[PDB]
């Protein structure tokens, strides 16, 4: 019923390993660019 059984699990292992690498690296690229905004500071100086 499922001749692809073994091959799909071998691929599944490779998919998990690549995701364990790519997810934190892509997460790191997101945080890298966004850090400009996440640490920005604002000040309001109206005339008096």
Binding mask 1-40 for ligand PEF (x = CB under 6 A): ---------xx--xx--xx--x------------------
User: Which residue, 11 or 29, is less far from ligand PEF as judged by CB?
Assistant: 11
Q: How many C-beta neighbours within 10 Å does residue 28 have?
A: 9
Cα 2 to Cα 6, 13, 38: the distances in Å are 9, 18, 49
Cα end-to-end distance, the chain, whole Å: 80
User: Which residue, 25 or 36, is less far from ligand PEF as judged by CB?
Assistant: 25
CB of 14 to ligand PEF, least distance (A): 3
């Amino acid at each position: 019923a499922e001749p692809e059984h073994d091959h799909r699990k071998r691929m599944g292992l490779k998919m998990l390993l690549m995701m364990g690498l790519l997810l934190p690296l892509v997460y790191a690229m997101k945080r890298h660019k966004w850090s400009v905004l996440k640490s920005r500071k604002l000040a309001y100086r109206p005339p008096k």
